[PDB]
Design a protein around this ligand. Structure first.
Ligand SMILES: CCCCCCCCCCCCCCCCCC(=O)OC[C@H](COP(=O)([O-])OCC[N+](C)(C)C)OC(=O)CCCCCCCCCCCCCCCCC
Ligand SMILES: CCCCCCCCCCCCCCCCCC(=O)OC[C@H](COP(=O)([O-])OCC[N+](C)(C)C)OC(=O)CCCCCCCCCCCCCCCCC
Ligand SMILES: CCCCCCCCCCCCCCCCCC(=O)OC[C@H](COP(=O)([O-])OCC[N+](C)(C)C)OC(=O)CCCCCCCCCCCCCCCCC
Ligand SMILES: CCCCCCCCCCCCCCCCCC(=O)OC[C@H](COP(=O)(O)OCCN)OC(=O)CCCCCCCCCCCCCCCCC
Ligand SMILES: CCCCCCCCCCCCCCCCCC(=O)OC[C@H](COP(=O)(O)OCCN)OC(=O)CCCCCCCCCCCCCCCCC
Ligand SMILES: CCCCCCCCCCCCCCCCCC(=O)OC[C@H](COP(=O)(O)OCCN)OC(=O)CCCCCCCCCCCCCCCCC
Lengths: 171, 98, 105, 318, 172, 96, 115, 83, 345
């Protein structure tokens, strides 16, 4: 059939974070609370338009805000975040329960400077209602014409003409 | 996956041929029946895992339950056959032809 | 015959897991959810011979998604041509396809 | 490095089971107002090595009326299943981390039963046949009981893993929440290991040697190694599941030491049971399990279904 | 490491061939135990481990009771393993040669694409959710407790009625 | 004690899953970009160098739907190395 | 791959042990040595005759109870469900009917080893 | 009743396993129906976030859903925090 | 027996076909078939004679093999389309395997060999339960896939079942084997009309069931096993003779009995679909069926075979016949031809 269109390497190039999973999980709550608007815009476009090829600008914005968040972390206070993410990196599951003291020091850092508040137990896991100006895709799934149903017969139910009409049975 | 499914279908075919061709042993016939059952279980599990049909994943467990019930009934009937004759021979149980 | 006590009584004993695009356990999909959804929405209301005739496009797309015969044949043709060019010495694979690539997250 | 890890798991386990034979002989002797071996080694420590060398330098003596293929396959199967069963245990980090570790344990135990059955049928002798049939009855009874026990205990736990058991028993043992399940599990581990009171597969008094009566030295030593490795393993599994050792993220050495102490205590408990009690009849074992443990464990399985629901203490998935 | 599942499927085919060739039921149960272990490995390779371990445990119990019964009643003085008749061995190797011949024919006839020698090991797992929690097998078998209670109740009634059935058959 | 500790573990699991949720969009964006990069390099390597057969379309799909169909593992790692294909097929399964 | 290597290493270890056991010592094989044991007398039967086990009904019940076990085993993932009331009711019904079957068999003397 | 009490006491003396099993069966039936924590298990399993919360569009006609996770709106988990 | 297990077994016998005919999932149809088979086996082996044991064994292995082939077809359909119903575009190989396995479940030729064997050596009420109730669930599955069936294989199975049933009933002297071959012939007629009209195979199934229920009831009254045993019925129950003869003639398809109606309307529909060759051959072998019925009528009603001395004591004693079941079904299975437009649907 048709030729599938997909973007080029130039428009797929982006400044990647190059940041490990343990430091990502250490900074996860404040990253999720700092720019949740950009992330929710990307998720909204991704779930509305199922095509990944029309959300690349939103993905680059997600990378940009993540980079800005980590640059703020690196600029303001870096060594308690470093010891916190290394303590998380030590364990085999990156459990938050092991190193709550370093978590407390990093939260004290981000509360004294930049005024960040860590989200509560059930705050990051709810719907968000993000405002956007991108138009709603009127035809997801690229649906076809949906052919019309059968022409249903309407009318009054008259009795059967001349009975059952089964051979010699008159009635 | 298509090669493996072809192999599983051929395994079911072989176990069906074993069920149809008797060799003097009702127990061996029941063994061929359970080989057919195992082949069907593996086919259903592989299909559900490939298609990610987690809603249809209870189907292999259901066929396993009913297959073990029928194997139980077959073993009970084999016990009755052995009590009747003492040899468990399908050619020995033949007296209903007249 | 086919009694319809489930439709008469309004219950659903076995109707929510009839096909792939139907009520996965947590929120998951079944790898052809969109294609099976399009096929069923095409075929509903006109079922039988008309659904076999004028939903053939949707059914062919769904069958291609589920069985992947055409993708297998296309990939086999590409790999066969690649191996022929390797034998004839007219092709050198790029570094990313064969060997060391630059990893991106 | 992984082969070095395999060696440091396998070789200490084999030395541990050889000295388990030594410890069994000495403990039984000292409970019998005598000594154990104290002549072969400085304190008898060379006695298992002398026994092993004698068994591997006697002839294996293949018999005439014997299915040779199964006769050879069964002891090697038993030993490799014992070591494979030793594989996924965490102390506190397993060699091989399995999501369905307990299911793997159950499958491997049933396959070990098959090793015993194939040996008994292949050694074409009447006493071997008797031992095989007794093994069939025994594994029927303890298999159904063990499956229910593990279901209820791991319902109190989260997944079917064992690091999750460590994290569950981080604060308190599982013996205090489910001690009747621990008692029935201890009895079921005795039945699984074919140990006294209800050994009944190598019954020296009812039979001559049971399923080993035609096995001469060599493969007989393989069967003995598999049995005693399974003894240490069932005690180790009991102390991992129920008597949870102290776990600290900074150092695991105290976890390994606590696991060692409790496993040694339960192995000595097995030898204690053997010294104390006479043998069951193998129909009495089936009656005992199916009439006492199975109704009680069905009721307790129902109670442990209901318990996290009405206490809201449902364990996490991970 | 690509054709691992194909090797397992071939071993399953061989085990089912032996079971069809019908040894003494001791060796039939052996072949079914081997086939059950191999099918467990195939299910584990294709995905979730719960279904494979379940069928392994179930067939272990089943073949154990089968072993007891073929010792009790389905036995004879000389239980044939495979070599009592040379026809059985010749037919086993004939079936193996026919298997090799048919897979070579289907590799040569690559139009349909059921079996391909070059494309083997390329289409084992089609699409998987790379990031995601609770997507393994066993979650659906748990959903039998909540989403398919009809499946659960027909299985439970099958086992209950089966208890009554076996007692009434072997009542004597 | 089991009730209290299991409730605490439920709270810890909710915290871990919320960290996962907060990190989800970044992983989604990077995953989509990597998938598109692999598809684009496969399309170019099939396009220019591989196919000079007269009856062949380069970017031809196998569906008439003209929408996004996510690629298969064998589709996106087919031209790659056999070790990479085996890692994509049996990485998580064999990692034990 | 790791578990596969450990399994193969254990199998090769057992094979090496039995190969050492078979090729190390000295062999002296004759008929009276390799005859079946039978407590110092020639066996009357061939040890392949029918055995007539006495717990056959218990074995069939074990098959059914093993499949009830297979039904009951996905409970650790079943308790994570969002409904939990139908889950609790279904688990109660399953365990209750299994117990009712066991009680009926006990009353009808099924597990009593009929000779 | 005298006969019922005598029968139960004799059963408790002679077969104290069936008595325990039936008592545990009855306790496991009764206890979820009288516990005040039964709804909490279902609510905890509901509140456990195994999936991504897909955001909705802002049409401006829904004031119930929040605009940001750091908002008073939405299903707060203070009951689980204080449970 | 025992009332508790009687209730369990009979409820499962009822529950099997009900699940099969009321379930839209092929897996649930298969578990209904399994329910029916496993539930009806202990009712078969109940007298604990060698013949009952043999019949139970034969029935078990036959139905287990057929159900395994059914499950193979279901799994292959699930592989091909991902659904749990043969919708419209399944494989003809899958559909033909489904038809073959359901034919072996039903017991029509050339899969018919077990049916007279199992019906023999089994008590008469269990033969009635088999030959009537066990043939509804496979027929329900066959009616559910009403199109997308191979008419060639359908017509071949139908014609060979009618031929072999006519020949077998012609040869047999045992009453249960006669009833089994009658079952094979009528199942051949139902299968013949299956791909063209589900209403007509339902009608023929209902006519056959209400025709062979009182035949089995009249056999059950005196425990008459053979042609001679039914021949000394003029001394045992002389009031039975007219209804026995009329029901045998109705099973033969003679006008103006209502058993002529299913054959007549099936021939009419096959004329409408241009299968005159098959219809003519089926009608001639139905005449053969009527021949062995008429020999039975000669034995039991139109002549008086010799009787023995102890039938005097049999006349001395008193009997009991079920109200609302025998006479109602006999009248509705003999004198309901003028309600033919009401019977067809
Ligand atoms: C394709 C490769 C997969 C394997 C198939 C080809 C090779 C095997 C073909 C079948 C051989 C059957 C045979 O000879 O049986 C006779 C033998 C029985 O013979 P026997 O032992 O009674 O007699 C031999 C006696 N001597 C040595 C004195 C001559 O049976 C077996 O070998 C079956 C044992 C099990 C084999 C499989 C074990 C798998 C692991 C289990 C754990
Ligand atoms: C792993 C941790 C340690 C475990 C213990 C290890 C050390 C102790 C070892 C002792 C020796 C064991 C060697 C083998 C012994 C074999 C014999 C044997 O044990 O037989 C079993 C015996 C059987 O006794 P029996 O067979 O004599 O019984 C007679 C029965 N008839 C007449 C029918 C034959 O006991 C049991 O079955 C009991 C099992 C444990 C029961 C636990 C109940 C706990 C309480 C529950 C709740 C009660 C309150 C109710 C609700 C109230 C609500 C308010
Ligand atoms: C516990 C784990 C390891 C278990 C295995 C044991 C490892 C250590 C083994 C050390 C000793 C090795 C040789 C043992 C030989 C035992 C049999 C023996 O003495 O045979 C004498 C026989 C003597 O043979 P012969 O020539 O006298 O003839 C035998 C026949 N007669 C006597 C009747 C004429 O064989 C040998 O001497 C073989 C020596 C092999 C040495 C290999 C090293
Ligand atoms: C194809 C269908 C025919 C297969 C015939 C196999 C050999 C044979 O004749 O088996 C009959 C045998 C009957 O049982 P038995 O007790 O052994 O009777 C001895 C007969 N005097 O029955 C048996 O021994 C059972 C045999 C079961 C075989 C199942 C596996 C079949 C695999 C091969 C499929 C066909 C291959 C054809 C190859 C042709 C040449 C390339
Ligand atoms: C003397 C002959 C003996 C023959 C019998 C040998 C018995 C071996 C021991 C018993 C095995 C019982 C079945 C166990 C199956 C594996 C259990 C399991 O859960 O495996 C899955 C696991 C990874 O799964 P999971 O834990 O979910 O991890 C995902 C993220 N971590 O891991 C995997 O996916 C790994 C998959 C492979 C593991 C098994 C390898 C077996 C290799 C073949 C052995 C036999 C070979 C034939 C005989 C050789 C000659 C004698
Ligand atoms: C819903 C039901 C299921 C719930 C879960 C519990 C599962 C229990 C399964 C087994 C129950 C069987 C009961 C009937 C039975 O078979 O009893 C047999 C037993 C006598 O058999 P036995 O001990 O072998 O004696 C040999 C000769 N004297 O008989 C006896 O010993 C008589 C016992 C009489 C008392 C029974 C217990 C009453 C408890 C009341 C508790 C109220 C609070």
């Amino acid at each position: 059939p048709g030729i599938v269109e997909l973007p080029t390497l130039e428009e797929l190039k982006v400044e990647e974070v190059k940041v490990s999973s343990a430091v990502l999980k250490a900074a996860a709550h404040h990253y999720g609370a700092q720019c949740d608007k950009t992330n929710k815009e990307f998720m909204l476009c991704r779930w509305e338009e199922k095509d990944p090829r029309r959300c690349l600008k939103e993905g680059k914005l997600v990378n940009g805000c993540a980079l800005n968040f980590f640059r703020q972390i690196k600029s303001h206070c870096a060594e308690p975040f470093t010891e916190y993410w290394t303590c998380l990196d030590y364990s085999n599951m990156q459990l938050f329960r092991h190193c709550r003291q370093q978590q407390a020091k990093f939260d004290q850092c981000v509360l004294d400077k930049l005024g960040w508040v860590r989200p509560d137990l059930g705050q990051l896991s709810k719907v968000t209602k993000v405002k956007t100006d991108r138009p709603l895709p009127e035809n997801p799934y690229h649906s076809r014409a949906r052919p019309e149903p059968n022409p249903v017969i309407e009318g009054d139910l008259k009795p059967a003409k001349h009975g059952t009409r089964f051979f010699f049975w008159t009635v | 996956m298509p090669s493996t499914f072809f192999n599983l279908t051929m395994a079911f075919s072989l176990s069906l041929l074993g069920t149809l061709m008797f060799r003097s042993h009702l127990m061996s016939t029941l063994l061929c029946l359970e080989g057919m059952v195992l082949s069907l279980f593996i086919m259903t599990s592989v299909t559900s895992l490939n298609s990610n049909s987690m809603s249809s994943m209870p189907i292999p467990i259901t066929i396993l339950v009913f297959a073990a019930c029928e194997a139980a009934v077959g073993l009970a009937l084999l016990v009755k056959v052995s009590n009747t004759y003492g040899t468990d021979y399908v050619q020995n149980l033949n007296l209903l032809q007249c | 015959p086919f009694l319809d006590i489930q439709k008469k009584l309004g219950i659903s004993l076995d109707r929510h897991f009839m096909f792939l695009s139907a009520e996965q356990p947590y929120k998951n999909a079944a790898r052809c959810h969109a294609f099976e959804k399009e096929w069923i929405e095409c075929a509903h209301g006109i079922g039988g011979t008309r659904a076999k005739k004028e939903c053939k496009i949707e059914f062919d797309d769904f069958e291609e998604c589920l069985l992947r015969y055409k993708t297998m044949r296309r990939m086999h043709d590409i790999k066969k041509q690649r191996e022929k060019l390797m034998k004839e010495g007219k092709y050198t694979p790029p570094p990313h396809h064969s060997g060391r690539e630059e990893p991106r997250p | 490095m992984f082969f070095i890890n395999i060696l440091t798991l396998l070789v200490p386990i084999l030395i541990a089971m050889a000295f388990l034979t030594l410890v069994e002989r000495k403990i039984l002797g000292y409970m019998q107002l005598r000594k154990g071996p104290n002549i072969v080694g400085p304190y008898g420590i060379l006695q298992p090595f002398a026994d092993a060398m004698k068994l591997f330098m006697k002839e294996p003596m293949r018999p005439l009326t014997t299915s040779m293929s199964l006769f050879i396959i069964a002891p090697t199967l038993s030993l490799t299943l014992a070591l494979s069963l030793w594989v996924p245990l965490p102390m506190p980090h397993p060699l091989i981390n399995l999501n369905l570790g307990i299911l793997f344990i159950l499958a491997t135990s049933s396959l070990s039963v098959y090793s015993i059955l194939w040996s008994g049928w292949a050694s074409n002798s009447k006493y071997s046949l008797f031992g095989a049939l007794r093994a069939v009855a025994q594994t029927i009874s303890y298999e159904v009981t063990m499956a229910i026990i593990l279901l209820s205990v791991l319902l109190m736990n989260g997944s079917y893993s064992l690091q999750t058991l460590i994290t569950t028993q981080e604060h308190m043992w599982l013996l205090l929440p489910a001690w009747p399940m621990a008692m029935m599990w201890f009895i079921s581990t005795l039945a699984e290991t074919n140990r006294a009171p209800f050994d009944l597969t190598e019954g020296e008094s009812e039979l001559v040697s049971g399923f080993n009566v035609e096995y001469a030295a060599g493969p007989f030593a393989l069967f003995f190694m598999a049995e005693y490795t399974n003894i240490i393993l069932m005690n180790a599994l009991t102390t991992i599941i129920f008597l949870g050792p102290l776990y600290y993220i900074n150092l695991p050495e105290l976890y390994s030491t606590n696991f060692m102490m409790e496993a040694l205590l339960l192995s000595s408990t097995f030898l204690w049971i053997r010294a104390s009690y006479p043998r069951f009849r193998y129909d009495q074992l089936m009656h005992l399990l199916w009439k006492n443990f199975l109704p009680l464990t069905l009721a307790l399985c129902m109670w442990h279904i209901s318990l996290p629901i009405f206490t809201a203490g449902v364990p996490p998935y991970m | 490491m690509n054709n691992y599942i194909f090797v397992l499927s071939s071993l399953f085919l061989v085990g089912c061939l032996g079971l069809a060739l019908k040894p003494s039921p001791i060796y039939g149960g052996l072949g079914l135990i081997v086939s059950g272990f191999v099918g467990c490995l195939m299910v584990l390779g294709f995905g979730g481990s719960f279904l494979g371990l379940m069928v392994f445990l179930i067939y272990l119990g089943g073949m154990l009771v089968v072993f007891g019964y073929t010792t009790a009643m389905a036995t004879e003085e000389y239980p044939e393993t495979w070599g009592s008749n040379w026809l059985i061995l010749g037919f086993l190797v004939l079936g193996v040669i026919m298997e090799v011949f048919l897979i070579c024919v289907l590799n040569y006839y690559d139009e349909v694409g059921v079996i391909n020698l070059d494309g083997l090991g390329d289409w084992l797992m089609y699409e998987v959710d790379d990031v995601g929690v609770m997507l393994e097998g066993g979650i659906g078998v748990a959903a039998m407790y909540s989403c398919a209670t009809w499946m659960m109740v027909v299985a439970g009634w099958s086992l209950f009625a089966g208890i009554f059935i076996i007692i009434e058959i072997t009542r004597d | 004690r089991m009730m209290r500790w299991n409730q605490e573990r439920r709270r810890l699991l909710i915290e871990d899953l919320e960290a996962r949720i907060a990190l989800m969009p970044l992983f989604q964006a990077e995953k989509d970009r990597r998938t598109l990069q692999i598809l684009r390099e496969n399309l170019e390597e099939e396009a220019i160098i591989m196919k000079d057969v007269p009856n062949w379309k380069v970017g031809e799909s196998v569906f008439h739907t003209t929408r996004w169909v996510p690629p298969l593992i064998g589709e996106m790692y087919g031209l790659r190395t056999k070790e990479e294909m085996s890692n994509a097929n049996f990485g998580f399964t064999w990692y034990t | 791959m790791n578990l596969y290597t450990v399994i193969f290493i254990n199998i090769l270890l057992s094979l090496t042990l039995i190969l050492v056991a078979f090729w190390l010592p000295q062999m002296n094989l004759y008929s009276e040595k390799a005859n079946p044991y039978e407590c110092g007398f020639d066996p009357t039967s061939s040890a392949r005759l029918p055995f007539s086990m006495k717990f056959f009904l218990v074995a069939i019940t074990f098959l059914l109870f093993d499949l009830e076990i297979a039904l009951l085993l996905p409970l650790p993932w079943a308790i994570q469900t969002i409904k939990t009331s139908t889950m609790m009711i279904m688990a109660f019904i399953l365990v209750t009917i299994l117990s009712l079957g066991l009680a009926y068999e006990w009353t009808q003397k099924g597990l009593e080893w009929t000779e | 009743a005298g006969r019922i009490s005598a029968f139960l006491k004799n059963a408790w003396a002679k077969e104290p396993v069936l008595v325990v099993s039936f008592s545990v069966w009855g306790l496991a039936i009764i206890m979820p129906m009288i516990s005040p924590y039964t709804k909490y298990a279902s609510m905890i399993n509901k509140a456990t976030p195994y999936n991504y919360p897909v955001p909705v569009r802002d049409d401006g006609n829904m004031p119930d859903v929040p605009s940001h996770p750091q908002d008073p709106l939405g299903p707060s988990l203070d009951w689980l925090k204080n449970l | 027996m025992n009332p508790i297990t009687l209730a369990i077994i009979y409820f499962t016998i009822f529950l099997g076909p009900v699940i099969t005919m009321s379930s839209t999932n092929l897996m649930l149809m298969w578990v209904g078939l399994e329910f029916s088979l496993l539930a009806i086996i202990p009712m078969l082996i109940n007298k604990k004679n060698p013949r009952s044991t043999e019949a139970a064994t034969k029935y078990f292995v036959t139905q287990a093999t057929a159900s395994m082939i059914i499950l193979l077809a279901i799994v292959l359909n699930y592989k091909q389309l991902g659904t749990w119903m043969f919708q419209q575009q399944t494989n003809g190989l899958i559909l033909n395997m489904t038809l073959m396995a359901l034919s072996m479940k039903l017991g029509l030729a050339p899969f018919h060999f077990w049916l007279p064997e199992v019906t023999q050596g089994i008590p008469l009420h269990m033969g009635l339960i088999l030959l009537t109730w066990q043939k509804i669930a496979p027929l329900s599955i066959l009616i559910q896939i009403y199109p997308l069936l191979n008419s060639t294989i359908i017509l071949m199975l139908a014609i060979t079942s009618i031929f072999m049933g006519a020949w077998g009933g012609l040869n047999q002297t045992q009453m249960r084997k006669i009833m089994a071959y009658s079952s094979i012939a009528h199942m051949g007629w139902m299968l013949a009309i299956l791909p063209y009209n589900p209403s007509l195979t339902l009608l023929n199934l209902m006519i056959y069931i209400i025709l062979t229920a009182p035949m089995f009831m009249a056999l059950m009254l005196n425990n008459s096993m053979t042609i001679n045993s039914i021949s000394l019925l003029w001394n045992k129950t002389p009031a039975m003779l007219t209804m026995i003869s009329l029901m045998l003639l109705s099973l033969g398809g003679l006008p103006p009995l209502t058993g002529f109606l299913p054959k007549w309307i099936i021939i009419t529909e096959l004329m409408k679909n241009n299968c005159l060759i098959m219809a003519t051959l089926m009608a001639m072998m139905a005449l053969l069926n009527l021949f062995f019925y008429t020999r039975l009528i000669y034995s039991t009603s139109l002549t008086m075979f010799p009787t023995n001395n102890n039938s005097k004591m049999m006349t001395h004693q008193t009997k009991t016949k079920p109200n609302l079941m025998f006479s109602t079904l006999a009248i509705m299975s003999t004198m309901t031809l003028p309600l033919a437009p009401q019977l067809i649907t």
